[PDB]
Amino acid sequence: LEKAREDLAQIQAYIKNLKDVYTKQMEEKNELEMKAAKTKKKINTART
């Protein structure tokens, strides 16, 4: 049980890191999407 509890604490820390890591990844993805939209608008303006 003590070994299991240590493993469980490690797992909870890993889950929080994954969740926080996932939120950071989502923010990065949103920034990338905004940059892509700006680049597409610039390309359309350039073609016109």
Partner 1 sequence: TINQMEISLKEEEIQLNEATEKTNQLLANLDKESKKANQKGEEVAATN
Per CB under 8 A, 42 contacts partner 1: yes
Secondary structure (DSSP) of the chain: -HHHHHHHHHHHHHHHHHHHHHHHHHHHHHHHHHHHHHHHHHHHHHH-
Is residue 30 a contact residue for partner 1 (CB under 8 A)?
A: no
Is residue 2 a contact point for partner 1 (CB under 8 A)?
A: no
Using CB under 8 A, list all residues that contact partner 1.
1, 4-5, 7-8, 11, 14-15, 18, 21-22, 25, 28-29, 32, 35-36, 39-40, 42-43, 46-47
